[PDB]
Amino acid sequence: ANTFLEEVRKGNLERECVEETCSYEEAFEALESSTATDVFWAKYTACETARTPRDKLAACLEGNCAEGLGTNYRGHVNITRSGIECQLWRSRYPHKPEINCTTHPGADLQENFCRNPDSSTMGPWCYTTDPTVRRQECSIPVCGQDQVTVAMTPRSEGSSVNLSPPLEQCVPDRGQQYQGRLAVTTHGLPCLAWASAQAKALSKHQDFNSAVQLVENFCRNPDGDEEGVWCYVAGKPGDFGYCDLNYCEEAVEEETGDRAIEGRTATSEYQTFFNPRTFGSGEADCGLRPLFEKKSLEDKTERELLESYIDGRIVEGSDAEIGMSPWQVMLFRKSPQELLCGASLISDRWVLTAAHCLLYPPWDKNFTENDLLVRIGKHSRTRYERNIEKISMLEKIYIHPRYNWRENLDRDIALMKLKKPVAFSDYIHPVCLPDRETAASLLQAGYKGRVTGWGNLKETWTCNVGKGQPSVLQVVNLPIVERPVCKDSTRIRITDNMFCAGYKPDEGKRGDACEGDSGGPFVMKSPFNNRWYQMGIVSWGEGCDRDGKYGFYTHVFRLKKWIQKVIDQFGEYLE
Ligand SMILES: *[C@@H]1O[C@H](CO)[C@@H](O[C@@H]2O[C@H](CO)[C@@H](O)[C@H](O)[C@@H]2O)[C@H](O)[C@H]1NC(C)=O
Ligand SMILES: *[C@@H]1O[C@H](CO)[C@@H](O)[C@H](O)[C@H]1NC(C)=O
Ligand SMILES: [Mg+2]
Ligand SMILES: [Mg+2]
Ligand SMILES: [Mg+2]
Ligand SMILES: [Mg+2]
Ligand SMILES: [Mg+2]
Ligand SMILES: [Mg+2]
């Protein structure tokens, strides 16, 4: 095609095993090729149920139809039978495919269509972008005949005569101002009674600014938590539960209601709000790096932190600076070894990463407490540094109620505890804490964000050829992205418990709007008080897989009181 000699051969061949029959050695005569020989075979025997006529045959090997089943089919359709888009033929989000990128070159499993290189027990399928379902078949005509192999299902969103119909109007103040009768939660669980047998005798040393009455057995929020209401449950002695419900669009960026200059004069001012014996340390002393904040030493990228400094360019992966986040933490598997996820640090005894990292069945995984291990304050991922870095075990799997992997990583969050605690050092030092009221005032002004890692985020999700992971950590700053802007980027609907965070992107590239460690850190530094206030965990983003999208990481500002409760509960399973 397109020329003389590559064309020339075409004619000879339209006639050989098409209308007549042919062979290996017959093919190997007029062919003049070694490997190309088998480009044929895939589609040929795929169309086993038609040797003659060429008329009926026509569509099969052209590759826009299903003969019998459709191993001839290489055709191009974005979607599957129902509606929610197919997955690519290499990226592993949401469900991991069993067929990874190296295995089948026969079908040439690239792009995002529907394939069947392997003997399906129903028909030609592709993986979905919905988590509820792993794979499904798709709807193509017969080869040389008009007949869809499978039916469609549309699925839709209505209003005042399709749904039921409902229309509420929202709950203000994030759970305080509510009096309701509900007793159903996320998994499908109940409440327990506030003045019966187990909702008074342990309400012992806690902040009860009690305006609302103690009524019966519903979900409430009298403390003043900024998430919402919750009530109690029971099992292998453990958790309570936030009752799942629709809320307002009360964002933290610019709350409406009634270039600037620099300041410093202060060394620690904060709200001592947490219980240092069972909870322990990390509350006052945090985010004041041993090698930087304390000496008043900067790093290369503090000078540049403003939104309007040099009016927008793109930045590359930099071989990063030593010990400048001594709160960095790894994650691995027992027998055998395996690099799993990224994380983040706060105290001598408490820990964090993003909740995807274990309880996600599509990769077959109830890896309970003891499948696991950690290494801390590291640098050269290829090496071990023994002294500077250290080793401690992890405790138990504390489930956050609102985490929904089946849905769409909505509240991608949980908690754990260190087994043996750890000491404060040059190489070892935690990061600091902004509440809602801190978080809000911060983000109106023009400043930047930061994430780091060994490209473990960049690693885990796709195949990604050539670009081998950096054994040293990677660093680079990032800008803010407005809420008026971010929406129309993607047509799939968006949440206010996550955020857009990436550069102004380009056409022909994968991009670095997606870096660091998965479950890794989304950190910052205060000009108020010189502390290091974090504002997210490094979770998945469209930018990783989907070209020309943004670096995407999780919110933090709401749940001040979730763990305020937990810290007294830690001690109750002891001895
Ligand atoms: C399949 O998904 C494609 C992504 O590779 C989409 O391609 C884009 O489509 C827009 C128009 O909607 C173009 O302007 C843009 O240049 C790009 O090609 C596309 O929506 C979709 N294709 C089909 C056939 O549905
Ligand atoms: C994992 O399996 C164990 C026993 O096989 C079970 O008791 C436990 O409930 C599971 N994990 C979680 C978090 O439910
Ligand atoms: Mg012919
Ligand atoms: Mg011969
Ligand atoms: Mg021959
Ligand atoms: Mg011949
Ligand atoms: Mg011949
Ligand atoms: Mg020839």
Give, in degrees to the nearest 5, the angle at Cα 477 between 471 and 483. Answer: 130
Q: Count CA atoms closer than 13 A to 565's CA, side-chain side.
A: 21
Ligand 2 atom with the smallest distance to the CA of 359 is: 13
**Cβ(368) to ligand 2 under 6 A?**
yes
Question: Resolution to 1 decimal, in Å?
Answer: 6.0
Q: Residue 113 Cα, ligand 3 centroid: separation in angstroms?
A: 30
Whole-number Å distance between alpha carbons of 538 and 354: 7
Instruction: Quickly name the fold that domain 13-159 has.
Output: Plasminogen Kringle 4 (2.40.20)
Strand segments (E) across 250-405: 318-319, 332-333, 344-345, 350-352, 372-373, 398-399
Q: How far is CA 367 from the centre of its chain?
A: 19
Among 186, 360, 364, 366, residue to substitute to test ligand 2 (most atoms within 8 Å of Cβ): 366
Whole-number Å distance between alpha carbons of 562 and 400: 9
Q: Residue 333 Cα, ligand 7 centroid: separation in angstroms?
A: 58
Give, in degrees to the nearest 5, the angle at Cα 409 between 408 and 415. Answer: 160
Instruction: For residue 111, give both structure tokens.
Output: 């792009």
Q: Residue 45 Cα, ligand 7 centroid: separation in angstroms?
A: 20
Of the candidates 239, 310, 263, 282, the one whose C-alpha atom is nearest the C-alpha of residue 422 is 282
412 belongs to the catalytic site: yes
Catalytic choice (281, 344, 379, 412)? 412
127 DSSP assignment: E
**Residues in the chain, overall count:** 575
* Residues carrying CATH 2.40.20.10, the chain: 13-159, 168-250
Q: What are phi and psi of 66, to 5 degrees?
A: -120, 105
Q: What are phi and psi of 28, to 5 degrees?
A: -75, 70
Instruction: For residue 147, give both structure tokens.
Output: 């007949």
Task: Tell me the three state secondary structure of residue 135.
Answer: strand
Contacts of 395 (CB under 8 A, 6+ apart): 369, 416, 417, 418, 419
Helix (H) or strand (E) holding 485: helix 483-486
Q: How far is CA 533 from the centre of its chain?
A: 22
Residue nearest (by alpha carbon) to ligand 2 atom 2: 366
| Residue 519 and residue 65 in contact, taking contact as beta carbons nearer than 8 Å | no
Instruction: For residue 173, give both structure tokens.
Output: 């103040």
Contacts of 297 (CB under 8 A, 6+ apart): 291
Locate all alpha helices (DSSP H) within 387-471, ordered by sequence. Answer: 436-444, 456-460
- Which residue's entry shows tokens 């020989």? 37
- Which residue's entry shows tokens 């409760």? 565
The pocket of ion ligand 7, defined by CB under 5 A, consists of: 29-30
Catalytic choice (91, 281, 344, 518)? 518
| Residue 148 and residue 140 in contact, taking contact as beta carbons nearer than 8 Å | yes
Contacts of 540 (CB under 8 A, 6+ apart): 93, 356, 409, 457, 461, 518, 552
318 bridge partner residues: 475
| Residue 536 and residue 554 in contact, taking contact as beta carbons nearer than 8 Å | yes
Task: Tell me the three state secondary structure of residue 399.
Answer: strand
Query: For the domain bounded by 168-250, which CATH number is listed?
Result: 2.40.20.10
Give, in degrees to the nearest 5, the angle at Cα 568 between 417 and 333. Answer: 10
Whole-number Å distance between alpha carbons of 541 and 110: 21
Instruction: For residue 193, give both structure tokens.
Output: 């009674």
Among 358, 368, 416, residue to substitute to test ligand 2 (most atoms within 8 Å of Cβ): 368
| Residue 357 and residue 519 in contact, taking contact as beta carbons nearer than 8 Å | yes
205 belongs to the catalytic site: no
Whole-number Å distance between alpha carbons of 156 and 419: 48
| Count of C-beta atoms within a 10 Å radius of residue 271 | 11
Q: According to the entry, how was the structure determined?
A: X-ray
Task: Tell me the three state secondary structure of residue 8.
Answer: helix
Helix (H) or strand (E) holding 5: helix 5-8
Query: What are the CB-based long-range contacts (under 8 Å, 24+) for 386-391?
Result: 388/426, 388/427, 389/427, 390/422, 390/428
Of the candidates 388, 390, 387, 396, the one whose C-alpha atom is nearest the C-alpha of residue 418 is 396
Whole-number Å distance between alpha carbons of 4 and 363: 51
> What are the distances in angstroms from CA 459 to CA 51, 235, 498?
46, 37, 22
Whole-number Å distance between alpha carbons of 497 and 264: 31
Instruction: For residue 535, give both structure tokens.
Output: 């504002």
Instruction: For residue 296, give both structure tokens.
Output: 């008043």
